[PDB]
Amino acid sequence: GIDAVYPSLVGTADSKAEGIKNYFKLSFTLPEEQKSRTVGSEAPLKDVAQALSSRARYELFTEKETANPAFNGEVIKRYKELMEHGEGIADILRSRLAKFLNTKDVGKRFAQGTEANRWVGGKLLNIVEQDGDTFKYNEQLLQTAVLAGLQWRLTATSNTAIKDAKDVAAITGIDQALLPEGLVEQFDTGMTLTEAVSSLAQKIESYWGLSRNPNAPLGYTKGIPTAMAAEILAAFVESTDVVENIVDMSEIDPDNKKTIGLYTITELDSFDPINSFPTAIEEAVLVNPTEKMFFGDDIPPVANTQLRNPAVRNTPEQKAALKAEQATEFYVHTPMVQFYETLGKDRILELMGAGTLNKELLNDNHAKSLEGKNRSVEDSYNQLFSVIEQVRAQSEDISTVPIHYAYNMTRVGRMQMLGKYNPQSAKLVREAILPTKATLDLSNQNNEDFSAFQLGLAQALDIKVHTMTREVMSDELTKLLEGNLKPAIDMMVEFNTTGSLPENAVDVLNTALGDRKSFVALMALMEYSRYLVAEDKSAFVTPLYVEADGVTNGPINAMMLMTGGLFTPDWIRNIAKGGLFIGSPNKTMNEHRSTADNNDLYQASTNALMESLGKLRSNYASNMPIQSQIDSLLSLMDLFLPDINLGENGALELKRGIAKNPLTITIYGSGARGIAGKLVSSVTDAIYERMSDVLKARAKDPNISAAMAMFGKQAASEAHAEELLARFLKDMETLTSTVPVKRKGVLELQSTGTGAKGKINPKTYTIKGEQLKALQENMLHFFVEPLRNGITQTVGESLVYSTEQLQKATQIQSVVLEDMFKQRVQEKLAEKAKDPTWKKGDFLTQKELNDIQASLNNLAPMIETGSQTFYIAGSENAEVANQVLATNLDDRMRVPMSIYAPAQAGVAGIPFMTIGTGDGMMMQTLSTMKGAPKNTLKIFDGMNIGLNDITDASRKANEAVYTSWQGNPIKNVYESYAKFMKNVDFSKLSPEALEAIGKSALEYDQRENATVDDIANAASLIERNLRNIALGVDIRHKVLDKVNLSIDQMAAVGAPYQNNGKIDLSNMTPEQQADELNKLFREELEARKQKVAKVGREHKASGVRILSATAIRNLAKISNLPSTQAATLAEIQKSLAAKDYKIIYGTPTQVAEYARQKNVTELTSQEMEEAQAGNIYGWTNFDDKTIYLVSPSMETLIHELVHASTFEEVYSFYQGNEVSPTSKQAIENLEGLMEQFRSLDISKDSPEMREAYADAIATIEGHLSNGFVDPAISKAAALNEFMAWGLANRALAAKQKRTSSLVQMVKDVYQAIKKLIWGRKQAPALGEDMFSNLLFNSAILMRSQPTTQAVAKDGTLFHSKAYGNNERLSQLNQTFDKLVTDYLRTDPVTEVERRGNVANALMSATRLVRDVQSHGFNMTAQEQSVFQMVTAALATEAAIDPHAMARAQELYTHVMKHLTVEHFMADPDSTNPADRYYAQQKYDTISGANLVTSLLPTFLGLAMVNEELRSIIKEMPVPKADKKLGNDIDTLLTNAGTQVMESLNRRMAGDQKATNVQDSIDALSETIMAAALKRESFYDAVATPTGNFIDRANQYVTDSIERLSEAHLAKLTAAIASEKQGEIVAQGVMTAMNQGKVWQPFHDLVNDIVGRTKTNANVYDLIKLVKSQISQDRQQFREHLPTVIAGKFSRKL
């Protein structure tokens, strides 16, 4: 033991004594085995100096036969100098020891007997050796530590993996996803004080080779090395090896003030020989090294615990996936590493970054953000070539050395490589080290291997492969290769045969690639250039890959795991965007995006945002200053942030899987204030970047203006840029000098100082302080709140409910666990305080902490799912200890005490379950499934696949998605919450803890004066809610497994997976599929419930009975109601019988079956919670005047007659009709009460009354804040819901209640309805029963016309080969919507004659659009719609402002001087007279001869859409007057077009009613409506893969025949169309069919049709057979035959 080894330690070694004590030999034991080779060496420094003398000596020390060949002669010399450097710092520590022995007579006091070794900063004196008068370190304990410090210096940051997200939020107070760019990347440079010394203290303990004492105070087993590690950290920062930095984000944050210090270690020279082998000392002193690179057969072990979660043990299923990943082998790519080193590190930075950087040509705020951008690349560049240098030393061929990596399980159940820079995280290393390989036959360009080769190249160059067919993708790829990228490819071809690059290589690549610049784009060019120069193209070996990426993986996974209740048609359509197709076998994502829908979930959320903003803006028609504030915010965003779809799509940033999109951030529970800060930070970054362009433009020409140097590329003239500058300055001052505030449901503007003034000064421009705060306040109220409503509309309101309950349960559980852990360490400190041995400054033992942690097991802290384990509250906090661990000898650096204890989870509950169970289980299954794909790199939600296994590995990836979607996150969380309620005691919590749980369990009004019994009642109510959500999810997954599905979530190739369901759901509309799925949902509910327990005509096909008008007249007597109100029904009966009201009633099954047969949408109200109660309600169809009842009684039938009649008066009043004067006052009186209804205080009411009020408000406000529904319909619905609430709560409020404000409201509304029902005649006295407890329970159905913005925005992103797939037109159509379509009035359009002035311009412009296409300019359906819409926008503006087309006249006249007929002829010297005729036809239209005034707007519109005309125009010379701008004629024409529309945008955004332009806009909206519906008809008419009119028609008829009806010869015809002989196809097709015998199967079918041969088949069976043969011949002869002919050429013609 330690008594035997170095027994010359100072002090007494006894456990207890009265004299001085040495606690080192007590807190540390002696392991029996060997861990450090210097345990028995007095002088370890000379033990390694002799070890590193030569290769022969190095072999014997480590006890192995062979060493790493990289230990060559050069690195021996470099280690000798570094070893001497460690000796230089060894003597430095001696000097500080001598100073301590005499300064402040500490040694003299130590000589007296004072226990200074037990102090905060004296723990280092437990090891100091005795020399009598003087004292000194034990030499062995000192030398072994320096080697730990030296090895730490080289690999301090290399081994530091990616920091966890939870830790970053803890040290900042803001979620890492909402942090601005640059600061997040700054973590690689700086590490906090605790992190710097804890890492160094880990090495020191390991190098000593000792064992901790489990029964010793934590202030000695952990504080002794930490105190000495800080000493070694000193004299290292003294040599400037580490720098000191202070954070600024929290410093500049208007609210946060938590300053954080950072520590960054300086790098080393990239050419250092020591960089070729930096792990010589580590692998010599140690026995089993942990810092290693695995070559050949070296396989890493499997970790037994999670990452930074020692309490969680890896499950046996998890350990199988970790083993599989580390078995994959990697090889370097030789061509890339040779290309990288020729460019150099500096040229790489210029290409990838923003060019060369200098303080003169950069904004102050913009320049500092590039430091973190450039820091990552240089570190990654150095790391890659350090690894390669080690590989090259082991073999002559560097491309044949296998390399293995390490993996571990993170806190959310993902797999992450160990190391900061690796192929998983860094993208520079990704293209040099790959595990994929393939062999292809490229001798023919029509092969199938060439098609897969093209897919890899197209995806690398930023082409959306997962949205187009494989034929369309090849068309666009070839254009780039022979077009813009041609100069770059030619340069690359020269490099492959010369090894040299042009001087201006960086400039060439920037012009070629453009905005597609990425490290994978250079890979595509290298492989293509290698292909051209190869001679034998039949055995090409390439590492090119294609990644299978998920389509909105985040939101889609959450939508399938935390959704309950019945199915809805909205859910079916929205889930299709993720790749879940119902009733469509063998369907792929490419087919869906080409014929069904091209809008993803990210775009759908944005569309709903603009509808909510329009509704909010419309409510302030009487408050002009508020409206102008909204327009300023929108105008500023368009100038700098065209699209808000943020993400991890950068170029020089590491990949961590963090979600930074506004849609995903909101769902994960981020705060509203936090979101607004992130959006503001993006806008200001774009402003700062523009300030770095004016500085550069000034250098080239110091005479230009500020407007020219900023908005030059977007200006059509000199004066246009002046308008843009003035608009930008006006908007900026308004936002930063005014703030919106909320005053009882309305917004009021207030002044808070002054904003930015008139001075740019691009070098020193900054927005900060009070101006920054006013920016975020404007965005929070005007942008974030409308954004939340739009998200709830897409993902559904059922998922939002489940997220709130999950967050509340996880927050409450973590707060309790945090309080009891702190309450039990305070007891042990008090118990140990009386112990004489214990002394303040120590802490608990390791065993005591273990028992306290094990004492909370009855509260169920961990969640188990059967394959994964989660510990949300786990963290390495420091607030629990609230002490000081140790400090430096100069009392400068103080290290606090950190323990592994539970911590508050905040709002981390939601992202934990979505990622761990949705994506983690998906990607863990893929590794361990039967037949898993091999040789793939998987990052977090993608998987790189070699080109030889794409079609099969992409199908097993989709299969793993299906298995992942069978989990239940809510059920697993509930199982732990139920046990937590079983062993908790709320009366033993701290006063602050009870306050924290109150904020989650209770509302605002009931928060103050909260009783403990009130906290427990609400806390136990959440447990009931989770039980109902879990039950609903379980039934949903069981039902979905019984139908046929096709899953294409993770795919970019077109290989889906089938679930082999047996119930057919095809040939149905989305509303029909919901009815079928809801039937099975209720069937499963009935079976479980029974398990525990063990007058009118009738329809023929169902038990439903029908009651018509004039059939319930006698029912007045049957009810035997009082005679005073009996006469009322006699009047109600007459009214409803006048408009043909019929009543349908039956059992729930009978009434549901009737709807399916008659195609009726039902609105029955019942839930699983209501199923236990057992009450069903019907619905009313106001469109056709039909009432549907479920199991009616005498009371309910009477209640509905007086309810339907009442709603008719409400509908008529709000439709602009006239009503009785008595009814008009009653509705008006009710309307006024509703205004005060939503402003009451319910804090003094009964708990059961609060729930009723809460439900009413949520549904009422939804109708009022709805923008896509007709306001007349929405207004009536809101009032109808108000009456139902009052009648429902009359009984329970009239008794056992006080006279509260809400109670009086119930009594008033009841009387208000009484006057409305009875009219002007006398009503029954107050307090009398209405109709034996009258109630309103049936729902209403209402429909109306959709708005213009609804249909125009639907077809914006349509694209297809038969429809048109021009990308430039879609982007042009997007900017049109922002300027024109968004500002149209929300009311639905009408049809009036509209005689006026602008209406003449639109009629004239419509005729010219058609006339242009009939006189030489053919257009597709996509080009036609954009041509019509844009021209009508310029036509109405020119009819209001006569000088709008002044600039376009100058450009039109200049073009006419350099135009000739020969410009329109492909062959200038053709002989066919028809070729010249068509060219002359196009010339006349441009000259205006054919068109024969609104002629100018048509030309301006045509010059933007047509692609053939723009090619001719761009080659014309530029006038000398416009040479200053520096733009071609085509861009000058497109910039003039937006100027006209921008002027019109201001016209519609002002006071339309007073300007007398309201009628003119109503004419423009009609034209947009007409053109939107026309492109909705051409689309869906080509909705087939072939895009043919006939093919689509045949498919519709076939599916309509299978609905009513409720093989061999197909192979022979395939052989006829696949003949490759040449001598056989020359004999005709009659001979082949006669020789092919195919005439016999045809005879059998026709013989049945004619009747010669008898058969038992019906008509529908034979019709399905004849129509199946026709489609077979069309498929083979029109599609497959042309491919055979084209396959005989070795080229693409």
Numbering used by the authors: 1008 to 2101, 2124 to 2521, 2529 to 2642, 2664 to 2750
Q: Which of the paper's sentences describe this entry?
A:
N4-like phages have a genome size of about 75 kb, nearly twice that of T7, and encode around 70–90 ORFs, including a characteristic large virion-associated RNA polymerase (vRNAP) unique to this family of bacterial viruses. The massive 3,500-residue vRNAP 18,19, present in 4 ± 1 copies inside the mature virion 20, is ejected into the host upon infection. In stark contrast to the N4 transcriptional program, which has been studied extensively 17, many key questions about the role of phage N4 vRNAP as an ejection protein and its part in the DNA ejectosome remain unanswered. vRNAP (gp50) consists of three predicted domains: a likely membrane-spanning N-terminal domain (NTD), a single-subunit RNA polymerase (RNAP) domain, and a large C-terminal domain of unknown function (CTD). In this study, we use a complementary top-down and bottom-up approach by determining the cryo-EM structures of both the full-length recombinantly expressed vRNAP and the fully asymmetric N4 virion tail.
Single particle analysis (SPA) of cryomicrographs revealed a heterogeneous mix of particles with two predominant and two minor populations. 1007–2101) and a tightly bound complex of RNAP and CTD with an unresolved NTD, referred to as ΔNv-RNAP tight complex (res. N4 isolated RNAP and ΔN-vRNAP tight complex were real-space refined to a model to map correlation coefficients of CC = 0.90 and 0.84, respectively. The tight complex of the RNAP and CTD forms a compact structure where the CTD binds the RNAP on the opposing face of the DNA hairpin promoter binding site 24, leaving the region open for promoter binding. Despite a large binding interface of 1,659 Å2, PISA analysis of the C2 and RNAP interface indicates a weak interaction with a ΔG of nearly zero at −0.2. Interestingly, interactions are slightly stronger at a ΔG of Ȓ2.1 for RNAP to C1 with a 725 Å2 interface. A salt bridge between D2012 (RNAP) and R2279 (C1) likely serves as a clasp for stabilizing the tight complex, which is not predicted to be stable in solution. The CTD buries a large surface area of the RNAP occupied by the fingers and palm including the palm insertion and extended foot domains, but despite the extensive interface, the overall structure of the N4 RNAP domain is relatively unchanged in complex with the CTD (RMSD 3.7 Å), barring a few changes in subdomains unique to N4 and a subtle shift of the fingers. Cryo-EM reconstructions of the four high-resolution states provide clear evidence that the CTD drives the B-motif loop into the active site in a conformation that we predict is inactive. Although the CTD makes sparse contacts with RNAP, it allosterically regulates three crucial motifs of the RNAP core: the intercalating beta-hairpin, the B-motif loop, and the N4 plug module, thereby repressing transcriptional activity.
